[PDB]
Amino acid sequence: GSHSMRYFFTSVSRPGRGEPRFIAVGYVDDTQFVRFDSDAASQRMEPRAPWIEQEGPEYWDGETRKVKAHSQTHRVDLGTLRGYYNQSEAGSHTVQRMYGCDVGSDWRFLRGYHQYAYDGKDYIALKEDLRSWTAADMAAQTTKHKWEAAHVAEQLRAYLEGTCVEWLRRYLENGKETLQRTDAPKTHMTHHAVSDHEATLRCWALSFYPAEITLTWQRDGEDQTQDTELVETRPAGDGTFQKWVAVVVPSGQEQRYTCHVQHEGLPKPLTLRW
């Protein structure tokens, strides 16, 4: 199956004193592997997966250097954006950045991305072709002009199609015991009665990896979405994920309803009944 490496960065300004709170996290697929937190004591990029601990002090020195530079860019940005938007020094503001690369089953480059938001709104993003920019408003258009003049897209494209893919492969290989393992969902059904005429069936998927999954209900072999509730996929806290989907049914008619589960760890999609 497909894989990705993504980095996520948040800076939140602190108006009254000092620099922003900066938090950086790195992922391979749905596995966090590194973090930097400006409030933490170490002031180093820190490992969050055993397979990254393989990398030497030179790696850690390099990543720490770069991540501090990312923090300084964000600090400057928060000031620039306050100016662009004619805002006061009184309020706290947020910048968010995400970039990374997708590869397919053959581990070859599929897609790259680099996007930026200010106070939770799109600001500027690299287009799919990795050659041009989407600027949401006139402030971001001024940024676009600057980045065109400085050939920023060209630098990013080289990274996204090159280093990003190359190091994704490296991590996938080094972390193969977990990163290349799929954990099929463990499934079961629960039943509840709300009245003597209405029941709830809930189809559970637990302990699965990666997070991508599909859970659906059928009634007499036909798709059922009415009277269903599907919760957001949630982290278990041990690296795996959980989800459920429920349906409301007439008491006594539970037999018509079947839950269907699709996941990369199941060679055959799975069916459950009450």
């Binding site: 860019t73 950045r97 600001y123 280093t163």
Partner: peptide
């Protein structure tokens, strides 16, 4: 591996 350089807005 983080991107080498990060341009300011």
């Amino acid at each position: 591996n983080l991107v080498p350089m990060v341009a300011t807005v």
